[PDB]
Every structure is written in C-alpha cells, then in structure tokens.
Amino acid sequence: SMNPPPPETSNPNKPKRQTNQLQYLLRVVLKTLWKHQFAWPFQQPVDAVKLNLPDYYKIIKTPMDMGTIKKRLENNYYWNAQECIQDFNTMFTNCYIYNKPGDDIVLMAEALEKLFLQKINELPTE
Numbered sequence: 869s870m871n872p873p874p875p876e877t878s879n880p881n882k883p884k885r886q887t888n889q890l891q892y893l894l895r896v897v898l899k900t901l902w903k904h905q906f907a908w909p910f911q912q913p914v915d916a917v918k919l920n921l922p923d924y925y926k927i928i929k930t931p932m933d934m935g936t937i938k939k940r941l942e943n944n945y946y947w948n949a950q951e952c953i954q955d956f957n958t959m960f961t962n963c964y965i966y967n968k969p970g971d972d973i974v975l976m977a978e979a980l981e982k983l984f985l986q987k988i989n990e991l992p993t994e
C-alpha cells in the first residue's frame with residue numbers, strides 16, 4: 869500500500885502575500901482549531917497505509933489537512949484569504965465525502981467546522 873505525495877506547501881514561483889486577513893487565518897482560525905480536543909486526526913495528511921484505508925485516496929482526490937494549512941500559512945504560500953478558506957473547506961468536505969454520517973470523525977469535523985465558521989464570520993476587512 870502507498871500514500872500519495874502530500875499537498876505542496878512551498879512553490880517559489882507562486883506569487884505570495886502577507887495580508888491582515890491571512891494573519892487572522894493563522895493567529896485566530898488555525899490556532900483555534902489546532903488546539904481543539906478533536907484536532908488530532910486533521911493535523912497531518914491521512915496515512916492510508918497505517919490506517920488500512922486503501923480506498924481513501926481512491927475517493928479523495930483533493931486531500932487537505934491542517935498540517936498542510938499550517939505550513940502554508942507559516943510559509944506565506946497564499947495570495948489571499950479565500951485560498952486558505954478553500955483549503956479548510958476542502959478538508960471538511962473530504963471528511964464528509966469519505967465517511968458515513970454519524971461516524972466519530974464526522975462529529976469531530978463538525979465541531980471544528982462550527983468554530984471555523986464562527987471565526988471566519990469576523991474575518992477583518994483588508
């Protein structure tokens with residue numbers, strides 16, 4: 869069994885910015901979700917080999933996780949906040965796509981997503 873390469877966190881020719889919205893995404897949004905008691909299954913890419921989930925990357929073709937997002941934010945990978953918000957939403961959606969309704973992982977994603985929504989509701993103006 870094999871995992872795919874992880875999503876990139878560095879791309880020197882991709883234009884980048886540091887903006888107040890991106891700073892909020894790191895200092896408020898990421899930090900709030902990262903410390904949560906349910907964050908630990910989303911802090912790195914899904915290891916389909918160790919978890920014995922050979923169908924994970926058959927179904928999930930746009931993987932995303934908070935470890936990747938954290939590195940992207942710390943590395944100033946993004947141009948704008950929408951790119952990062954999209955990454956969080958990809959992470960949550962993948963969980964709902966792969967898993968069964970009511971599974972523990974889905975309840976964990978829902979708890980994190982609730983906080984995500986509350987924080988991005990107050991994304992500062994640029």
Ligand SMILES: Cc1[nH]c(-c2csc(N=C(N)N)n2)c2c1C(=O)CCC2
Binds near residue numbers: 962963973
């Ligand atoms: C998003 C996600 N994370 C995990 C998981 C289990 S154990 C672990 N440990 C880490 N990452 N330290 N992550 C799963 C999952 C799914 O969607 C399907 C089932 C398993």
